[PDB]
Design an enzyme around this catalytic site. Structure first.
Site, PDB file in Angstrom:
ATOM      1  CD  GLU A  35      44.374  12.685  25.609  1.00 63.44           C
ATOM      2  OE1 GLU A  35      44.352  12.931  26.833  1.00 63.44           O
ATOM      3  OE2 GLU A  35      44.422  13.576  24.728  1.00 63.44           O
ATOM      4  CG  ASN A  46      39.322  19.354  28.206  1.00 67.23           C
ATOM      5  OD1 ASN A  46      38.445  18.558  28.574  1.00 67.23           O
ATOM      6  ND2 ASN A  46      40.509  18.985  27.798  1.00 67.23           N
ATOM      7  CG  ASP A  48      36.849  22.797  26.089  1.00 65.55           C
ATOM      8  OD1 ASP A  48      37.046  22.428  27.237  1.00 65.55           O
ATOM      9  OD2 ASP A  48      36.756  21.978  25.160  1.00 65.55           O
ATOM     10  CB  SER A  50      34.537  20.218  27.624  1.00 64.66           C
ATOM     11  OG  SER A  50      35.826  19.726  27.232  1.00 64.66           O
ATOM     12  CG  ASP A  52      39.147  15.902  27.809  1.00 61.54           C
ATOM     13  OD1 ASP A  52      38.013  16.234  27.366  1.00 61.54           O
ATOM     14  OD2 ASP A  52      40.192  16.541  27.630  1.00 61.54           O
ATOM     15  CG  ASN A  59      35.430  17.932  25.061  1.00 56.36           C
ATOM     16  OD1 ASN A  59      34.395  18.120  25.711  1.00 56.36           O
ATOM     17  ND2 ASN A  59      36.205  18.909  24.636  1.00 56.36           N
ATOM     18  CG  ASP A 101      33.241  14.291  13.591  1.00 59.18           C
ATOM     19  OD1 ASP A 101      32.263  14.950  13.180  1.00 59.18           O
ATOM     20  OD2 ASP A 101      34.136  14.809  14.318  1.00 59.18           O
TER      21      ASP A 101
END
EC number: 3.2.1.17
Length: 129
Positions: A35, A46, A48, A50, A52, A59, A101
């Site tokens: 990453e 991203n 979306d 968002s 990173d 995110n 989570d």
């Protein structure tokens, strides 16, 4: 900061993550290369909207505060910039929870489609732990 392989390895045990909720020492090393390639300062865009952040590419959507990402959950309530900091201390603290989570490591794309089922303990060999 620009890292290298063993130069970071012990700085993670210091935070309490070896076999944390069962995920051993060998399984983490793999991911951060994927990453960010051992560099704290990289960030991904991203689809979306968002972004990173950090070596982990966390995110903005559920955890952190960037503000450009509207309606996001701010569960961490920390600056996403904190994630980028030269001092590693920040990131970890909100990372542990994310495994809690329930998807565990299955939240990360790389580790899943890139780190599972390998000799995870191979990445940690030759080194003094």
């Amino acid at each position: 900061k620009v890292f290298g392989r063993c130069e970071l390895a012990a700085a993670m045990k210091r935070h309490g993550l070896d076999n944390y909720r069962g995920y051993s020492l060998g399984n983490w090393v793999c991911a951060a290369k994927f990453e960010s390639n051992f560099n704290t300062q990289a960030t991904n865009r991203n689809t979306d909207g968002s972004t990173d952040y950090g070596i982990l590419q966390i995110n903005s959507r559920w955890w952190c505060n960037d503000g450009r990402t509207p309606g996001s959950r701010n569960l961490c309530n920390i600056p996403c910039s904190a994630l980028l900091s030269s001092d590693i201390t920040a990131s970890v603290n909100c990372a542990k929870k994310i495994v809690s989570d329930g998807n565990g490591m299955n939240a990360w794309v790389a580790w899943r489609n890139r780190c599972k089922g390998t000799d995870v303990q191979a990445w940690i060999r030759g080194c003094r732990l």
